[PDB]
Paper text:
The assembly of tau into amyloid filaments is associated with more than twenty neurodegenerative diseases, collectively termed tauopathies. Here, we describe twelve phosphomimetic, serine/threonine to aspartate, mutations in tau, which we termed PAD12, that collectively induce the *in vitro* assembly of full-length tau into filaments with the same structure as that of paired helical filaments extracted from the brains of individuals with Alzheimer’s disease. The tau sequence ([Fig fig1]) comprises an amino-terminal projection domain (residues 1-150), a proline-rich region (residues 151-243), four microtubule-binding repeats (R1-R4; residues 244-368) and a carboxy-terminal domain (residues 369-441). The tau folds of AD and CTE comprise residues from R3 and R4 and the carboxy-terminal domain.
Numbering used by the authors:
A (entry chain C), B (entry chain A), C (entry chain B), D (entry chain D), E (entry chain E), F (entry chain F): 297 to 318
The structure:
Amino acid sequence: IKHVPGGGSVQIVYKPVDLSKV
Amino acid sequence: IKHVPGGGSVQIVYKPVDLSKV
Amino acid sequence: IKHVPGGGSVQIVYKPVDLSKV
Amino acid sequence: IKHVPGGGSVQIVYKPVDLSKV
Amino acid sequence: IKHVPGGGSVQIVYKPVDLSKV
Amino acid sequence: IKHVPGGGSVQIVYKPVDLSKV
């Protein structure tokens, strides 16, 4: 019995710029 | 019995700039 | 920006019995 | 931007019995 | 920016019994 | 019995700049 969700994962975000207004 | 969620994960964010206004 | 691998994950094992021989 | 691999994932095993020989 | 691997995860094992022999 | 959430994790943020206004 094993449970192994989301293993070995990568995310990359390159040069993001945020100009949001609130 | 094992539970091994999210193992080995990477995140990269490269040169982010935040100019947000509140 | 979020990364959430294996997030919110569940395992349930109910009344397991082990009689293994080695 | 979200990344959520294996998110919300479930396993259930009910009354397992192990009789393995080694 | 957040990274949250395995976040919010649960395991339950209910009334396990071990009679293993070596 | 093991529970092993989020093991082996890396995060990298490279040369971030924060100019946020409140």
